[PDB]
């Protein structure tokens, strides 16, 4: 599709020339910042980004590429080399620890330093790092996790764990070994590490006795609590202070996000992960922006401020299914969650970042037209005669083989919502790519945010913005009324 | 490898400290440029830049992916939108008319607004827009095009021609229609829309009359000049001025770089594209950085300044087949030319930008250990009990079906120069990928680059800080003596 009022160069020149007014009269606020937002798209790489603004451009009944995102708006942007110390192309949990703690660390270990061994429990004494959040809250900021998955994942557990196996979710997971030589399961540490004011995301069974029915699935013995140790880690949260509330479903959450007599909530609404947003039961499950907005509105209580962790966890798990429909749905979703913290936060005090922990081997190509569907097929058919679609991932669950036979799909085929894109090789889950991601910041100190970065600067970013530990001496003055201008 | 050093967290720590040092020290440049430079790596989106920070480091000696590129020193980052007005999977063509005229435009064509269509020769009049690069000589600056592919490319023609099709090459490519409804091929108007004084890379048989023999290859008929006017375009472009030169090799390039008598410069390399770097008789052929060099050299001399265009474009053909040794190789050379030009260049005084015109569906993964090799293998076999590449492409001629018998390779087959990573679907050429790519940014005005950006805006930023046209009331300072 050829829009008419492209056509004409004088579009294309009134636009650049409005771009190069913002970009002249763009201001850094030069104050620290009284709120800490951290947005994270779980394997949302640059090449989901643009799908991303495709497919929520089309929705919205735009051509899709020259639509801004939610996180195009943002005034300042970075690239950010993901590499872990023993591995080049890395995992969610050695990245956990660089954006989260600001030290590198070891592929699949959380909240420890390289000096750690993956596996190795002992090798986690004395090595331990410790997150922004923590150093947040010992500041007397208040904090909160929100997440898709289940909060006991590598991302989430970066805030609060210390752990050289991000597969220890709860006691059941663990070696005898480990729990003999003082290891803690995420779970555990989740509720006893520190003081967390707001957890919501998914993960229920981790927390209950083996065998408690879980609310949403009583008849399924697959849902049901499993730790071996029968503590009930949603009591012992509870009975921590005044004030805390446990939900499990969205009316509970609503009911809490407006009670005076909740100034601390845990919610845990599904065994697991949540489930993917278009499979979402909306009067059961509440979207990841509606989420979002209750954290930030019992967060924004304390007027120390606050430190927010937020992550669209399940951008990587569509990609690791190879099933790109669930992936940018996903990262859709993710967006409108950093436009409502953007109708509920103010530039003037708060810094919000947006970026990725790393990315995948997901591209998209074949030359589509303008206004085409993400999920489409390319407009001239591949050398073997056959269709192509213009997504494709190079590894996963997509790779077919109907002997030395290649699918010839139709567009009904690969736009929908479980179809899986053609990969060059079979894997059961498709991998992680190690580029480079994008940050984006806004709010004070945001304008640090430049240049070709480190994973690990995100966190010393936050951390001297906020005025936190090692940044006590920020020499900052407190926010004001210094905006943008944009 | 677990380096020992980046087990302690204070190695994290200082590292992170440094880098909060450097951009709370950051000063955006607020004067006008006298000089002008973008480095455009034809394909090199972001897989690829990090890809080949890998590759640069350990040929450097270094694990690779901590050790900066010359591009990871620029203080200022921004995301680039490539689509082109008619395509959201962009070609070289259109992109070219946006990072260059900063107009966006239709796919295949270059020089043109949208309003004109591919192939239609008669669309193109009244629709033409005009490159900063022909804005940058009207203000009386010198103008430089430096490219490893013909400098016919789509690339570097957008710098100086308006055409509806791209493969315009010479007169031999185009129907009569065309020629008798007054259209120029690229080579004609290389040295016909305007005066540039520096033209380097490849691209000799489209400049002279047809059965010429090449000076390197007099015996091979598919090296001759191939114009049909029986024109010689290298003649009447030395004619057009006093001063001028033409070199074909790198002797003759470094002679000609000394000479105080050369003012102008023309120096074709090549029948058609350069050779790749890895394959570069280095006896005969300039490298891209060298060429770098000789144009920057002769373009300072002027005392209103430059505007010089550099090309990585072989980057795009070593991803086009598939075999991302030669895509990744062509890249560090690119990194180097961008070392070179800001050894001759101040930031007081230089805006250089450096971006892609778009990516490919080039990946690495496999979850590599660090230290490891760019084209080696991951450390666990397939679902298939057989081994991949970290490296992937989605599609393009590394497609391997035999039967359904997905190859073993192995390590060395893998680093070969020659070797094609597996791909999903077939195709003679791996097609571009949609996604953004980075703008980096350095010197007065740079500042400006910035955010998530239309590519179109990197012409408008370059004219701005240049005031050139339509910024000439652009309000700046002339140069002075702030650096970053
Ligand atoms: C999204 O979340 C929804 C909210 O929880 C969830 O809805 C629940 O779904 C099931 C249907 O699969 C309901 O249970 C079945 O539905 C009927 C319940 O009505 C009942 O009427 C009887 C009248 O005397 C009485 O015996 C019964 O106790 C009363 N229940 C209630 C809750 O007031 C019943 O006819 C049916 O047999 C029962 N049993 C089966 C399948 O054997 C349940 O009520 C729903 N809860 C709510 C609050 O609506 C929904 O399924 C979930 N998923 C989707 C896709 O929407
Ligand atoms: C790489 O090229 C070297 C230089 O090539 C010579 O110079 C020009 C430059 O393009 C070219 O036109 C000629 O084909 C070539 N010819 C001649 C007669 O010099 C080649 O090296 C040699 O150059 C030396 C002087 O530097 C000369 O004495 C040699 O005779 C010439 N080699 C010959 C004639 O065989 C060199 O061969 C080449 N290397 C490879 C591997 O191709
Ligand atoms: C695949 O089906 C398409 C119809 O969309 C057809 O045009 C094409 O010829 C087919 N390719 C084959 C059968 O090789
Ligand atoms: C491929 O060769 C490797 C040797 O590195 C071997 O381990 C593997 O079993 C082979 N795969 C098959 C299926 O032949
Ligand atoms: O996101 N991860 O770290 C992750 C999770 C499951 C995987 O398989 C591979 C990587
Ligand atoms: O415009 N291009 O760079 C381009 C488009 C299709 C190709 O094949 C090769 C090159
Ligand atoms: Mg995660
Ligand atoms: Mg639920
Ligand atoms: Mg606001
Ligand atoms: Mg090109
Ligand atoms: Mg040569
Ligand atoms: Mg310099
Ligand atoms: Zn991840
Ligand atoms: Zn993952
Ligand atoms: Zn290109
Ligand atoms: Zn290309």
């Known amino acids: ?81 993901t590499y872990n110390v023993d591995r080049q192309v890395p995992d969610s949990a050695g990245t956990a620890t660089a954006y989260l703690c600001g030290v590198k660390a070891n592929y699949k270990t959380i909240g420890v330093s390289a000096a750690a061994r993956f596996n190795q429990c002992n090798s986690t004494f004395g090595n331990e790092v410790f997150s922004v959040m923590h150093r947040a809250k010992k500041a007397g900021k208040s904090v909160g996790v929100v997440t898709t998955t289940r909060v006991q994942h590598a991302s989430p557990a ?16 663990m070696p005898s070994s480990a729990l003999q030589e003082g290891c803690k399961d995420i779970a555990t540490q989740l509720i006893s590490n520190m003081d967390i004011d707001v957890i919501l995301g998914g993960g229920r069974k981790f927390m209950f006795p083996k065998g408690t029915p879980d609310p949403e699935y009583p008849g399924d013995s697959d849902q049901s609590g499993v730790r071996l140790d029968s503590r009930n880690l949603v009591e012992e949260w509870l009975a921590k202070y005044q004030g805390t509330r446990y939900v499990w479903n969205r009316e509970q ?58 992550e669209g966890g399940r951008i990587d798990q569509g990609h690791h299914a190879g099933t790109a429909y669930l992936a940018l749905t996903e990262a859709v979703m993710f967006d ?58 190079g590894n996963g669950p997509g790779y077919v083989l109907n002997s030395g036979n290649r699918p010839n799909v139709t567009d009904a085929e690969s736009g929908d919502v479980n179809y899986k894109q053609q990969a060059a090789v079979p894997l059961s889950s498709e991998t992680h790519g190690g580029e480079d991601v994008a940050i984006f910041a806004r709010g004070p100190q945001a304008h640090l945010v430049h240049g070709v970065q480190e994973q690990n600067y995100i966190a010393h970013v936050m951390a001297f913005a906020g005025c936190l530990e090692p940044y006590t001496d920020c ?12």
């Open 253 to 310: 959450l609503m009911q809490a996000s407006q009670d005076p007599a909740v100034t601390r909530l845990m919610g845990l609404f599904e065994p697991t992960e949540m489930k993917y947003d278009v499979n979402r039961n909306a009067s059961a499950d509440p979207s990841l922006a509606e989420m979002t907005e209750v954290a930030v509105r019992l967060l924004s209580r304390n007027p120390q401020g606050f430190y927010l962790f937020v």
């Open 158 to 173: 970066g805030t609060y764990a210390h752990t050289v196996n991000r597969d220890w979710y709860s006691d059941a997971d």
């Open 1 to 81: 599709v050829i829009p008419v009022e492209e056509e004409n160069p004088v579009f294309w020149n009134q636009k650049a020339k409005e771009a190069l007014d913002v970009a002249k009269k763009l201001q850094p606020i030069q104050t620290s910042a009284k709120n800490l937002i951290l947005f994270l798209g779980d394997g949302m790489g640059v090449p989901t980004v643009t799908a991303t603004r495709i497919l929520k451009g089309q929705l919205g009944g735009h051509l899709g590429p020259e639509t801004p995102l939610a996180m195009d708006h943002f005034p300042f942007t970075a690239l950010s080399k």
């Open 336 to 393: 409108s969650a950093i436009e409502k913290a953007s109708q509920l936060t103010n530039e003037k005090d708060t810094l919000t970042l947006i970026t990725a922990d790393h990315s995948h081997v997901f591209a998209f190509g074949g030359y589509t037209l303008r206004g085409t569907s993400i999920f489409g097929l390319a407009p001239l058919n591949a050398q073997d005669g056959k269709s192509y679609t213009s997504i494709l991932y």
């Open 475 to 486: 020499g900052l003055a407190p926010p004001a009324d210094e905006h943008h201008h944009h």
